[PDB]
Amino acid sequence: LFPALSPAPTGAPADRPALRFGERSLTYAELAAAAGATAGRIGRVAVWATPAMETGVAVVAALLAGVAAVPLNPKSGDKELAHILSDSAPSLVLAPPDAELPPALGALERVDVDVRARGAVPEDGADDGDPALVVYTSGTTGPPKGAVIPRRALATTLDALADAWQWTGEDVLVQGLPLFHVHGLVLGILGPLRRGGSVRHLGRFSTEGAARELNDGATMLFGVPTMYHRIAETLPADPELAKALAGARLLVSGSAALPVHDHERIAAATGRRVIERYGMTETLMNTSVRADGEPRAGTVGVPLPGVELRLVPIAALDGESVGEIQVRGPNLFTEYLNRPDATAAAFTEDGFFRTGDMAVRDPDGYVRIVGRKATDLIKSGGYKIGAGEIENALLEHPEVREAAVTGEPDPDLGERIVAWIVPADPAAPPALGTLADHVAARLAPHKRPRVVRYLDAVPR
Ligand SMILES: Nc1ncnc2c1ncn2[C@@H]1O[C@H](COP(=O)(O)O)[C@@H](O)[C@H]1O
Ligand SMILES: [Cl-]
Ligand SMILES: [Cl-]
Ligand SMILES: [Mg+2]
């Protein structure tokens, strides 16, 4: 999976940079040795997945050990952690030494991840179908399902992207994405390691931080559309940001659609374009605009090598016939953990995954996502948010009789979460702050409502 880490590297390859988090870093040899020491201490494991160097070491340790990792959002609330802990039943939690863990984890064995530890890299005994990660992803109803992602899916999607993006071990990625989802963790940490390159993780994203790294040897930027919106807003005032983007080898957006107004403001300011790629937790990456392809706003390009894609079948490349994307390939997840009926429902009889995403293809083969088959989802900041679980949390509040949750457009977030409340007392309805704080404390801050509306009645 990482031939530059296992077996332990030697000579010049060993002293190449691997991970950089501000002034903290690890070379390939240092990462292999620190992850190896950790791997020997874990013969499923949870990872307290802060946007910090320890998270890279922890996940690489699990992969070297051949033990599935379950990334935890360090801002998850009590309900959300209890569910993941009960569902995935990890043996231990890998955490940074100084992390304050919440009481939901009080009974779990804590293994501190030491980035200065030096141990042997375990022998690789893993099989390609072995679970690599369990990544919790929201559905339209109920609590998040654990997508079990096999080792082979990681290798194949990362190598497919290497071909599409002309990504090599000479590339230096900058990113500031969360490390408990696929974009930040798989593409943004494991991808550079599989390639033999490096990543500079910003901790918290900022336009200034992205500019700094791209003006100082970073060659690629990955972000969600919200980050590109904030870049587009800042460009007129920020000459060094404009130069940073103009000089980049590749700018990539994903997790949600990049609006054409943001695309074109970036092109106006910098003279170059942002590649979009389309993927899902359950499928990893499906399509991308290629580095050697024509840049086309509002598209997600062509199927990646090894991905079988169809629209439903619609065979005309007409830019007009709307159909459901379905995919098959070694990029696919194994199952939803403990959910065999939901797993079976996600697949056609002949083994294609039903994405729910609606698309056309143009005469060049390019895919444009234009909607949904039956059921909108909510994407806020490039997080997929499930309405039903936000409703279920709001219903716990004593000032809420009934609740419905929807998304509405937001120029910065793509969509913002709306809470529709039948109050306990219509003359004293619960304020947004009380409801938002409650959902943040139960679920996670990114899932909080940003708007509240009161009604007499909501769907049952
Ligand atoms: N570049 C993109 N354009 C439009 N939608 C996207 C793109 N990348 C991912 N998505 C959406 O994100 C979903 C997967 O996100 P997730 O459920 O968080 O794994 C897909 O089903 C799409 O709806
Ligand atoms: Cl750090
Ligand atoms: Cl959060
Ligand atoms: Mg619903």
Side-chain angles (χ1 to χ4, degrees):
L1 191 55
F2 303 114
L5 293 170
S6 178
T10 200
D15 304 326
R16 290 159 72 82
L19 303 181
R20 295 191 68 193
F21 287 68
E23 76 269 41
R24 308 179 76 213
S25 65
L26 296 168
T27 62
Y28 275 82
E30 292 159 354
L31 173 57
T38 301
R41 179 93 186 56
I42 69 181
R44 310 190 186 87
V45 298
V47 177
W48 192 248
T50 52
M53 198 162 73
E54 282 76 8
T55 297
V57 174
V59 174
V60 171
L63 297 159
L64 293 178
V67 172
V70 188
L72 301 181
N73 175 359
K75 300 181 148 39
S76 283
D78 64 345
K79 190 184 192 181
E80 178 152 304
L81 288 178
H83 167 75
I84 289 166
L85 297 181
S86 282
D87 188 53
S88 66
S91 306
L92 55 96
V93 57
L94 292 167
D98 298 317
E100 51 295 267
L101 303 181
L105 294 189
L108 203 43
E109 182 182 355
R110 176 182 182 151
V111 173
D112 291 323
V113 176
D114 185 356
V115 302
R116 283 293 284 182
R118 229 197 261 302
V121 177
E123 305 277 316
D124 187 342
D127 284 323
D128 288 347
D130 286 352
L133 304 168
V134 188
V135 177
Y136 282 75
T137 184
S138 297
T140 54
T141 60
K145 299 183 217 74
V148 181
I149 303 172
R151 297 174 73 90
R152 82 157 48 84
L154 307 182
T156 59
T157 207
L158 296 173
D159 288 356
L161 294 172
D163 186 81
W165 288 354
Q166 292 170 3
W167 191 350
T168 73
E170 293 317 283
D171 282 299
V172 176
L173 175 67
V174 58
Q175 60 127 323
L177 294 156
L179 298 185
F180 53 91
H181 283 295
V182 158
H183 194 172
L185 179 65
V186 175
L187 275 52
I189 300 296
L190 309 187
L193 301 177
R194 179 133 174 124
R195 298 275 62 88
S198 62
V199 51
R200 308 182 186 174
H201 189 291
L202 298 173
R204 173 197 175 276
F205 177 81
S206 67
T207 66
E208 295 87 356
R212 174 184 170 154
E213 304 305 339
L214 286 171
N215 280 146
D216 185 37
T219 58
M220 299 170 65
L221 173 66
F222 294 170
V224 298
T226 296
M227 293 167 177
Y228 289 101
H229 178 71
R230 289 170 186 186
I231 285 171
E233 294 291 311
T234 297
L235 272 168
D238 204 324
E240 305 299 311
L241 175 65
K243 293 171 195 187
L245 301 169
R249 190 185 71 74
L250 208 67
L251 306 177
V252 184
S253 181
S255 310
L258 183 64
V260 69
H261 195 54
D262 293 321
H263 269 272
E264 296 315 325
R265 286 187 300 167
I266 292 163
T270 70
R272 57 78 61 66
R273 295 231 153 234
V274 183
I275 289 188
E276 291 192 75
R277 88 296 182 287
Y278 161 63
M280 314 188 50
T281 301
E282 296 94 328
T283 64
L284 307 181
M285 303 302 114
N286 298 318
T287 69
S288 186
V289 176
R290 293 177 54 89
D292 68 16
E294 315 273 359
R296 291 199 54 227
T299 180
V300 293
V302 299
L304 289 164
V307 179
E308 291 178 88
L309 183 152
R310 58 185 196 202
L311 296 189
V312 306
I314 298 174
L317 297 180
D318 62 15
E320 67 185 334
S321 297
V322 181
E324 182 189 30
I325 301 169
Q326 308 186 338
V327 295
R328 194 169 64 183
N331 53 303
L332 295 181
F333 80 145
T334 302
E335 63 184 49
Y336 300 115
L337 188 69
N338 302 321
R339 305 283 302 278
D341 289 352
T343 301
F347 281 100
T348 64
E349 286 272 12
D350 65 344
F352 286 72
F353 183 82
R354 308 163 191 280
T355 64
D357 296 302
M358 211 94 348
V360 297
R361 295 177 203 125
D362 284 333
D364 55 2
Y366 274 44
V367 173
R368 287 185 285 124
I369 294 165
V370 301
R372 300 279 305 166
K373 177 184 194 323
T375 237
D376 288 278
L377 350 136
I378 302 166
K379 273 273 184 175
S380 187
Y383 288 113
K384 190 178 82 204
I385 275 122
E389 71 159 340
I390 297 170
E391 292 164 353
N392 298 336
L394 288 159
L395 280 173
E396 301 164 346
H397 195 286
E399 303 299 331
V400 172
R401 285 185 184 266
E402 285 180 52
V405 168
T406 64
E408 73 179 5
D410 185 295
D412 175 79
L413 298 172
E415 294 185 273
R416 64 180 83 108
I417 299 163
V418 182
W420 306 83
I421 299 301
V422 183
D425 184 350
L432 175 62
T434 187
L435 302 175
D437 287 353
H438 172 78
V439 173
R442 300 284 285 161
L443 302 186
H446 77 264
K447 293 177 176 188
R448 77 195 183 274
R450 309 291 191 114
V451 179
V452 65
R453 295 181 204 279
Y454 308 109
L455 336 75
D456 305 348
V458 296
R460 285 164 184 175

